[PDB]
Design a protein around this motif. Structure first.
Motif, PDB file in Angstrom:
ATOM      1  N   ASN A 488       0.826  -1.209   0.000  1.00  0.00           N
ATOM      2  CA  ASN A 488       0.000   0.000   0.000  1.00  0.00           C
ATOM      3  C   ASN A 488       0.860   1.260   0.000  1.00  0.00           C
ATOM      4  O   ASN A 488       0.341   2.371  -0.010  1.00  0.00           O
ATOM      5  N   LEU A 489       2.175   1.088   0.025  1.00  0.00           N
ATOM      6  CA  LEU A 489       3.066   2.234   0.030  1.00  0.00           C
ATOM      7  C   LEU A 489       2.882   3.088  -1.233  1.00  0.00           C
ATOM      8  O   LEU A 489       2.814   4.315  -1.155  1.00  0.00           O
ATOM      9  N   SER A 490       2.779   2.441  -2.393  1.00  0.00           N
ATOM     10  CA  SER A 490       2.622   3.158  -3.666  1.00  0.00           C
ATOM     11  C   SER A 490       1.395   4.083  -3.730  1.00  0.00           C
ATOM     12  O   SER A 490       1.419   5.095  -4.431  1.00  0.00           O
ATOM     13  N   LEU A 491       0.331   3.734  -3.006  1.00  0.00           N
ATOM     14  CA  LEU A 491      -0.885   4.545  -2.977  1.00  0.00           C
ATOM     15  C   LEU A 491      -0.617   5.870  -2.274  1.00  0.00           C
ATOM     16  O   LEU A 491      -1.283   6.871  -2.539  1.00  0.00           O
ATOM     17  N   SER A 492       0.358   5.870  -1.369  1.00  0.00           N
ATOM     18  CA  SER A 492       0.713   7.083  -0.639  1.00  0.00           C
ATOM     19  C   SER A 492       1.854   7.859  -1.305  1.00  0.00           C
ATOM     20  O   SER A 492       1.905   9.081  -1.230  1.00  0.00           O
ATOM     21  N   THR A 493       2.761   7.147  -1.958  1.00  0.00           N
ATOM     22  CA  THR A 493       3.898   7.773  -2.623  1.00  0.00           C
ATOM     23  C   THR A 493       3.524   8.401  -3.974  1.00  0.00           C
ATOM     24  O   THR A 493       4.237   9.268  -4.483  1.00  0.00           O
ATOM     25  N   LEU A 494       2.411   7.960  -4.556  1.00  0.00           N
ATOM     26  CA  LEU A 494       1.940   8.495  -5.844  1.00  0.00           C
ATOM     27  C   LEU A 494       0.667   9.316  -5.603  1.00  0.00           C
ATOM     28  O   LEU A 494      -0.019   9.718  -6.551  1.00  0.00           O
ATOM     29  N   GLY A 495       0.367   9.562  -4.332  1.00  0.00           N
ATOM     30  CA  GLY A 495      -0.825  10.310  -3.981  1.00  0.00           C
ATOM     31  C   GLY A 495      -2.020   9.803  -4.760  1.00  0.00           C
ATOM     32  O   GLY A 495      -2.630  10.553  -5.514  1.00  0.00           O
ATOM     33  N   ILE A 496      -2.354   8.529  -4.596  1.00  0.00           N
ATOM     34  CA  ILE A 496      -3.491   7.949  -5.304  1.00  0.00           C
ATOM     35  C   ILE A 496      -4.752   7.967  -4.426  1.00  0.00           C
ATOM     36  O   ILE A 496      -5.883   7.968  -4.932  1.00  0.00           O
ATOM     37  N   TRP A 497      -4.552   8.000  -3.111  1.00  0.00           N
ATOM     38  CA  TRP A 497      -5.667   8.060  -2.178  1.00  0.00           C
ATOM     39  C   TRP A 497      -5.468   9.162  -1.139  1.00  0.00           C
ATOM     40  O   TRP A 497      -4.345   9.589  -0.859  1.00  0.00           O
ATOM     41  N   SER A 498      -6.582   9.628  -0.587  1.00  0.00           N
ATOM     42  CA  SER A 498      -6.570  10.679   0.413  1.00  0.00           C
ATOM     43  C   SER A 498      -6.488  10.058   1.792  1.00  0.00           C
ATOM     44  O   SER A 498      -6.814   8.890   1.974  1.00  0.00           O
TER      45      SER A 498
END
Length: 546
Positions: A488-498
Motif C-alpha cells: 500500500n506504500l505506492s498509494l501514498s507515494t503516488l498520492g493515489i488516495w486521500s
C-alpha cells in the motif's frame, strides 16, 4: 542465402531494406495496406481515489529500435552435448503413463479455448473468429498438409506492445497448431514439473508453503534470464519437438518435425511492412510459447542446479529441490547450503548454456531467505488469519496496480459484477479492494454476472467464495501487517488516495448494511461488526469464464 522454403517471401519484396539490422537478414520492405468500468471507477472516485494517478503503460521509429536492439542477433553459443544432457534430464521427469498418447481435439473443444479477436497475420485476411466462421476446412487442410510433411508459407507478423516486439503467426496457423497440439500447448494434463500457468492464483502460495515447510532451512533461488525469447536457440526448439514427440502419437510426429522445422528460421514482417529473417528465437504469438518456454526453463534450471551443487541430475528425487515456473519467471526451493551453492555457480553455467541471467553484483542469483519474500508471477505471498485462528496464504500485489487493472478493463453491470467477483477471489486480503468489490456486487442482484472474465459465479457470490476458498469472507479477520502496508506504500507515494479514503469507503458500506435485512456488504467481518448485522448467504458456485 535463405532456406529454400523461406524464399517465397523474397518474391514479394517491393522496396529496399529500410530497417538496419547487422546480423539478421533484412531483404527489403513490402507494400503495406482503454475504457473504464463505470460502476467500479465511480465507487473508487467516490471513495477519494484518483484514477488519473493510477499506473497505466506505438512509434514506427521506437519500434524499429526494439527490433535492432533485442531481436537482431546471432544464435547463442551453447555447450556441446548440452541438449543430449537436457534430454537426459527430461527422462528423469517424463511421465510413462502418457507416452505416445496425445492427439488432436475437436473444434468444439478448441472453440472453448481461443480468443475470437485473435489478430490476423500480415498477408492474412480474417481474424481468429472470422476463420472459425467460414474457413475451418482451410485450417483442417493445413493440418493434413503439415501432418504429412508438406512445408507451408510460414511467417510471423511483428507489432509493438499494443517497446517490446510481439511476433505471431497467422490466425489460420495458430488454429491448426492449437487444434492438434492442444493438450500439450494448454497443458491439460500438466506434465511440466512446477508449471503454475493453470494454477488458480488464490491457490498457488498455499501450495508452495506446504513445500517450503518440508525443508529444514528453506531458501528460494529465482530465475532471472534476460529477454528469454531472444535466447531461445534452434537446438532448443529441436529439443522441445523431441519432448512433444514423447507424448504425441507417432501419427503426429511428422507434423511436429515439420512445424519445428519452420520455427528454426522464420520470415518476419513488421506491421510497417519491413521484412527480416529471424534465426531461431521465440515469437510470443506462437501457441507453444508458454508450455515450450516452461519446460525449457525447467530442464535448463535442473541442469544448472545439479551442475552447481554436484547433485546427480540422475535423480535428485524431490525435497532436495522444488522448482516452479511460468514461462521464464520462476524459482527453486532447497536447503540453504545447496541453494547458496547454486546461487554462486548458477550464472556462469546458465550463460554457457545460452540463457544469460541479468547482470548482478558478485554475479549471484537472487535468494529469498523468508517465504514472505518470494516473488512469482508478478505476485508475492500475503499471510492471512481466519476467525478460528488458522493461518494461510493468498497472492499479493501492489494495491496501486490492483486498482488500475480493476478499473481500466479495456461495459455492462452484469460484467462489472464478474470483474468484481474475480478480484474478490484473488484479493479479499486487501480491505480496500475487498470493499470496492462488495459494493459493485451489491447492485442489481437480479442481474446474473457475465461469463466474459476469468471467473464468475452461479447463485450467491459470497457463497461462491466459500466454494473455492474454503471459508466465508466474514471469517477473514486479519492480513499480514507489514506486508499489507508495504503493498500500500505506492498509494501514498503516488498520492493515489486521500488520508480519508479508508474511512469514507467504510462509512459507505456501514450505511448500506445498517438497514435491516441481508445485505452483501455485511460479509466483510469489519462492516458486519459496525452494523451488528450478518449476511446469511445461500447456494453459490465458482466457474471459469474466458
Amino acid at each position: 542465402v535463405i532456406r529454400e522454403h523461406n524464399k517465397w517471401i523474397l518474391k514479394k519484396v517491393r522496396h529496399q531494406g529500410n530497417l538496419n539490422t547487422k546480423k539478421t537478414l533484412n531483404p527489403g520492405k513490402l507494400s503495406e495496406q482503454n475504457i473504464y468500468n463505470n460502476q467500479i471507477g465511480t465507487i473508487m472516485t467516490e471513495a477519494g481515489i484518483r484514477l488519473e494517478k493510477l499506473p497505466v503503460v506505438t512509434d514506427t521509429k521506437s519500434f524499429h529500435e526494439a527490433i535492432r536492439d533485442k531481436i537482431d542477433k546471432n544464435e547463442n553459443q551453447q555447450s556441446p552435448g548440452l541438449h543430449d544432457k537436457l534430454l537426459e534430464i527430461f527422462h528423469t521427469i517424463a511421465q510413462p503413463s502418457l507416452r505416445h498418447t496425445y492427439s488432436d481435439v475437436t473444434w468444439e473443444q478448441l472453440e472453448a479455448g481461443v480468443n475470437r479477436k485473435g489478430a490476423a497475420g500480415f498477408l492474412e485476411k480474417k481474424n481468429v473468429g472470422e476463420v472459425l466462421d467460414s474457413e475451418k476446412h482451410l485450417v483442417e487442410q493445413l493440418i493434413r498438409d503439415l501432418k504429412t510433411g508438406r512445408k507451408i508459407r510460414y511467417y510471423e507478423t511483428a507489432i509493438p506492445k499494443n517497446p517490446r516486439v510481439i511476433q505471431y503467426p497467422e490466425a489460420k496457423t495458430r488454429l491448426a497448431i492449437t487444434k492438434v497440439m492442444y493438450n500439450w500447448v494448454k497443458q491439460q494434463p500438466v506434465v511440466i514439473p512446477g508449471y503454475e500457468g493453470k494454477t488458480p492464483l488464490f491457490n498457488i502460495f498455499n501450495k508452495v508453503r506446504k513445500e517450503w515447510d518440508l525443508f529444514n532451512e528453506p531458501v528460494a533461488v529465482s530465475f532471472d534470464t534476460k529477454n528469454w525469447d531472444t535466447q531461445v536457440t534452434s537446438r532448443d526448439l529441436r529439443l522441445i519437438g523431441e519432448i512433444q514427440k514423447y507424448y504425441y502419437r507417432k501419427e503426429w510426429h511428422k507434423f511436429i518435425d515439420t512445424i519445428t522445422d519452420h520455427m528454426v528460421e522464420v520470415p518476419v514482417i513488421t506491421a510497417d511492412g519491413e521484412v527480416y529473417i529471424r534465426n531461431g528465437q521465440r515469437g510470443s504469438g506462437q501457441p507453444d510459447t508458454s508450455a515450450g518456454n516452461s519446460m525449457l526453463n525447467v530442464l535448463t534450471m535442473m541442469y544448472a542446479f545439479c551442475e552447481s551443487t554436484g547433485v546427480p541430475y540422475k535423480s535428485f528425487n524431490n525435497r532436495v529441490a522444488r522448482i516452479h515456473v511460468c514461462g521464464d519467471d520462476g524459482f527453486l526451493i532447497t536447503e540453504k547450503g545447496l541453494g547458496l551453492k547454486f546461487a554462486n555457480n548458477g550464472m556462469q553455467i546458465l550463460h554457457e548454456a545460452g540463457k544469460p541471467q541479468k547482470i548482478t553484483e558478485g554475479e549471484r542469483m537472487k535468494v529469498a531467505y523468508r517465504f514472505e519474500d518470494i516473488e512469482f508471477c508478478s505476485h508475492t505471498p500475503v499471510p492471512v488469519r481466519w476467525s478460528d485462528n488458522t493461518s494461510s496464504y493468498m497472492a499479493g500485489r501492489d494495491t496501486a496496480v490492483i486498482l488500475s487493472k480493476m478499473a481500466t478493463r479495456l461495459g455492462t453491470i452484469a460484467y462489472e459484477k464478474a470483474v468484481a467477483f474475480s478480484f474478490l477471489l484473488m484479493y479479499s486480503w486487501n480491505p480496500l479492494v475487498r470493499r470496492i468489490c462488495l459494493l459493485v456486487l451489491s447492485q442489481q442482484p437480479e442481474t446474473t454476472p457475465s461469463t466474459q472474465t476469468t471467473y464468475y459465479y452461479k447463485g450467491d457470490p459470497i457463497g461462491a467464495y466459500k466454494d473455492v476458498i474454503g471459508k466465508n469472507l466474514c471469517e477473514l479477520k486479519r492480513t499480514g501487517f507489514e506486508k499489507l502496508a508495504n503493498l500500500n506504500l505506492s498509494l501514498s507515494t503516488l498520492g493515489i488516495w486521500s488520508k480519508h479514503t479508508s474511512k469514507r469507503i467504510i462509512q459507505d458500506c456501514v450505511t448500506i448494511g445498517k438497514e435491516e435485512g441481508n445485505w452483501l456488504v455485511n460479509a466483510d467481518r469489519l462492516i458486519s461488526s459496525k452494523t451488528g448485522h450478518l449476511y446469511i448467504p445461500d447456494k453459490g458456485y465458482t466457474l471459469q469464464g474466458k
